[PDB]
Amino acid sequence: GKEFWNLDKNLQLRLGIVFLGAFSYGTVFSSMTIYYNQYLGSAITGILLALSAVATFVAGILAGFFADRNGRKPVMVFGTIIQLLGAALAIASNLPGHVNPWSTFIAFLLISFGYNFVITAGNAMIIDASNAENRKVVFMLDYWAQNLSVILGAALGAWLFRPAFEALLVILLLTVLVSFFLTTFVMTETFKPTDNIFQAYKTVLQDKTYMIFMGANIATTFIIMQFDNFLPVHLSNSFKTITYGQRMLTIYLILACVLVVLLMTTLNRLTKDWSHQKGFIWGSLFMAIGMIFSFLTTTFTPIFIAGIVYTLGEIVYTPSVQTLGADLMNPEKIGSYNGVAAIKMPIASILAGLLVSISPMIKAIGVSLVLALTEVLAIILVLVAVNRHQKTK
């Protein structure tokens, strides 16, 4: 909190923008599958969400490059303009009595795209206006702001999603505006280069030390991808109802976000002068242990505790990995590096989903072995990467 007021103006805007972004995500985007399922098929909803994910990954790659090629600010400003167009069109597509789902999909496809521009470039900018001393503070403040805001979003969302959709859309447009003005007027450019998209990425992919870290990061973000692919299947398939797996899985998310909001500062106090190599390993250890405990148990009391363990790990892990990457990052090609960092979520997700296809054969005990084993791999790759980088001092 006190740290926030002593930061660079640009970084403060970054926190503001992500706050608003996450809030609006919570309220509207969390419940968009409900919307799509209602108006379109579940075959359609699945195809739609697949396209949006591919769309946003491509947004991230383009934003990463253009953040390096031109400045960070133009890209960010472009993103907000895209968002305005999407938000306005989504408002006009959801008029009561004249609700157009397909139009709303396209509008939301725009908003997601526009948002990842502001995110991808914003990440590059975080590195630009940060020094090695305050970098971790920024990353955690970022991470904290998002969690608190997704909760506030979720609360308002539940109350008004079904009754007053348009109200949220109006609010979404208004948050986009706030963010747009901020990005245009208040924000100052942080990077001046001294290009070819393939050549821009070829260099980052040729960075073996970063690529190793990327592989480690994919394995630790693979554990997070559990909520997306194997925690629901587990609970829906075999959760003992207490006077409802999908309802329990929902609790877990709420619990975790609440725990981050509350224990951020506290757990940070204990980890204040830890190495990033350490934080990654302790975080990625508790995260794997928490998931394994959840997978092997089907009762409320153990799962709830198991969830507490995972969140302990996630809180430490998140800022530590985010700083480690920045240190391994080339100062001239930060944008391209953040672009490459987009691949961690789809790959970690695809593998977790692919793993879930074989879930019935191997079962919970079998699944956990694969998690533990891949987490051990993450530890190996982080040490390899940190070691190689340490030389470059």
Ligand SMILES: CCCCCCCCCCCCCC(=O)OC[C@H](COP(=O)([O-])O)OC(=O)CCCCCCCCCCCCC
């Ligand atoms: C309803 C089932 C789905 C049908 C297939 C839609 C998929 C195609 C992609 C989108 C094409 C535009 C359709 C549309 O209405 O969306 C945009 C928006 C909303 O119109 P409204 O909500 O004000 O009636 O209006 C605008 O922004 C553009 C309006 C001006 C030009 C006419 C274009 C068609 C408008 C819809 C038809 C007229 C309704 C009275």
Ligand SMILES: CCCCCCCCCCCCO[C@H]1O[C@H](CO)[C@@H](O[C@H]2O[C@H](CO)[C@@H](O)[C@H](O)[C@H]2O)[C@H](O)[C@H]1O
């Ligand atoms: C004032 C204090 C308030 C404290 C908590 C308030 C919570 C208010 C609403 C919480 C809603 C939590 O859960 C509700 O949104 C979640 C966010 O995507 C959904 O979670 C859904 O999207 C997630 C994102 O990838 C997926 O991993 C889940 O598998 C999917 O089910 C839940 O399925 C939905 O039921």
Ligand SMILES: CCOc1ccc(-c2nc3ccc(-c4nc5ccc(N6CCN(C)CC6)cc5[nH]4)cc3[nH]2)cc1
């Ligand atoms: C063909 C292309 O296929 C693709 C497939 C998937 C994705 C994809 N992109 C994603 C981005 C984010 C997430 C995601 N899922 C999460 C589940 C939980 C959490 N939280 C964060 C908050 N803490 C407190 C609890 C855990 C974060 C999460 N982030 C999943 C995602 N899946 C992209 C392309």
